[PDB]
Amino acid sequence: EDIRKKVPAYDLMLEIIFNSILKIETDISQIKNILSIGGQSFEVKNLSKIYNNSKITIIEPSEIMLNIVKNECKNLKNLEYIYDKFENYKDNKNFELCLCLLVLQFIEEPQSFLEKIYNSLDSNGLLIISIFSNKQLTYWKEFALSRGAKKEQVEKTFNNQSEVMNILSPEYVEGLLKESGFSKIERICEVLSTDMWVVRK
Amino acid sequence: IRKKVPAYDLMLEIIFNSILKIETDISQIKNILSIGGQSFEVKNLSKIYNNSKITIIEPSEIMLNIVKNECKNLKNLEYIYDKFENYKDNKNFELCLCLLVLQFIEEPQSFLEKIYNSLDSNGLLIISIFSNKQLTYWKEFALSRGAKKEQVEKTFNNQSEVMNILSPEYVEGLLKESGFSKIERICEVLSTDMWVVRK
Numbered sequence A: 001e002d003i004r005k006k007v008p009a010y011d012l013m014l015e016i017i018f019n020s021i022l023k024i025e026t027d028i029s030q031i032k033n034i035l036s037i038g039g040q041s042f043e044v045k046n047l048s049k050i051y052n053n054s055k056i057t058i059i060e061p062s063e064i065m066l067n068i069v070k071n072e073c074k075n076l077k078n079l080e081y082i083y084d085k086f087e088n089y090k091d092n093k094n095f096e097l098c099l100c101l102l103v104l105q106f107i108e109e110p111q112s113f114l115e116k117i118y119n120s121l122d123s124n125g126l127l128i129i130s131i132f133s134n135k136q137l138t139y140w141k142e143f144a145l146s147r148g149a150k151k152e153q154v155e156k157t158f159n160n161q162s163e164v165m166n167i168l169s170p171e172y173v174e175g176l177l178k179e180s181g182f183s184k185i186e187r188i189c190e191v192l193s194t195d196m197w198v199v200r201k
Numbered sequence B: 001i002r003k004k005v006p007a008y009d010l011m012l013e014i015i016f017n018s019i020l021k022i023e024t025d026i027s028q029i030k031n032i033l034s035i036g037g038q039s040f041e042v043k044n045l046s047k048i049y050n051n052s053k054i055t056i057i058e059p060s061e062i063m064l065n066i067v068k069n070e071c072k073n074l075k076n077l078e079y080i081y082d083k084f085e086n087y088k089d090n091k092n093f094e095l096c097l098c099l100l101v102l103q104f105i106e107e108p109q110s111f112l113e114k115i116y117n118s119l120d121s122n123g124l125l126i127i128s129i130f131s132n133k134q135l136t137y138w139k140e141f142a143l144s145r146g147a148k149k150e151q152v153e154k155t156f157n158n159q160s161e162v163m164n165i166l167s168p169e170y171v172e173g174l175l176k177e178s179g180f181s182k183i184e185r186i187c188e189v190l191s192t193d194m195w196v197v198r199k
Helices: A012-026 A043-048 A063-073 A109-118 A137-146 A149-160 A172-179 B007-023 B039-046 B060-072 B110-120 B134-142 B148-157 B166-177
Strands: A033-037 A055-059 A079-080 A097-102 A121-132 A184-191 A194-200 B031-035 B053-057 B077-079 B092-099 B119-129 B182-189 B194-196
Touching: A012 A043, A012 A097, A012 A121, A012 B134, A033 A043, A033 A109, A033 A172, A043 A055, A043 A063, A043 A097, A055 A063, A063 B182, A097 A109, A097 B007, A109 A172, A121 A172, A137 A149, A137 B007, A172 A184, A172 A194, B007 B039, B007 B119, B007 B182, B007 B194, B031 B039, B031 B110, B039 B053, B039 B060, B039 B092, B092 B110, B110 B119, B110 B148, B110 B166, B119 B166, B134 B148, B166 B182, B166 B194
Parallel strands: A033 A055, A033 A097, A055 A079, A097 A121, B031 B053, B031 B092, B053 B077, B092 B119
Antiparallel strands: A121 A194, A184 A194, A184 B182, B119 B194, B182 B194
């Protein structure tokens, strides 16, 4: 609603994941466990439809957000909800796939967060991760205002981004991923202040 | 074409809703060069810059006529009845749009040098390409949007029979060799790129 007015390529990023990347990078038979971190209902629903024989583990940064997503997915049958935040989630379960979309800019300690993802993934597990960055915010600001984003919110992100989120450059985020241990890092999308990478353990 | 080019609509939205607002003042824009433009580009340029003359150059008379009919009642359009390679006019432009054209250009280096020489000092070029990057992902993206399988497979397996094989890196080098002072990539989505460029 308002998130699509603030994030260029929001819908496009999702379409690329579900219509291309996962088709190419995953085998439905080999995908047992999927980790969804901070996901919205649309991505949960598409993961459920593509990987019906898999278990999708849902972790949200608050009980309030967990409840919103649980209500919107009330009928799906292959979901497991974790009633804690990811920083406190301690389970030997190893995953073949992890989706972490537009989350990292809201994470208190991004380095240990990504290391935990790395340790939760299977040997050749796949991570798809996207961010809102600090790049080209002047262009982003006009883009957002043109889409009906609330002017006060845009000005705060534009002028005082640190009051809203982590200030993340794409370069430092690639460094965070490399320090976490990931072998292969490939950027598939950069549109103004957004980036998305496909990452392999 | 929207079925084959990721961010097609998105690139246009960014140009007209953001880039041009920030990088141009309507009062200073007198002459606009549109190369290989579609009707939507021309119409939006005509709306934003009503007091500007928009020069329209298309790679063939056939394409020129299609764009002519679709813009029949716009009144600030000038049509050139020849291809850009043969266009020889001293007119200096403050803005040039060249979207998804370069991969179809026989001699891209002299093409971009001509754009450079046609631009005014501190003139603005917005340029986008279909590249050779991430075609495996592109192929699935295109097929899932309803693009013709045969066309996709020919671009995927034999791109040079369809278009120039352009890496983003070589295109930035082509721009640099042409003389441009400032090159900034604003969009890269699979096999597409768009830059904002200043003379």
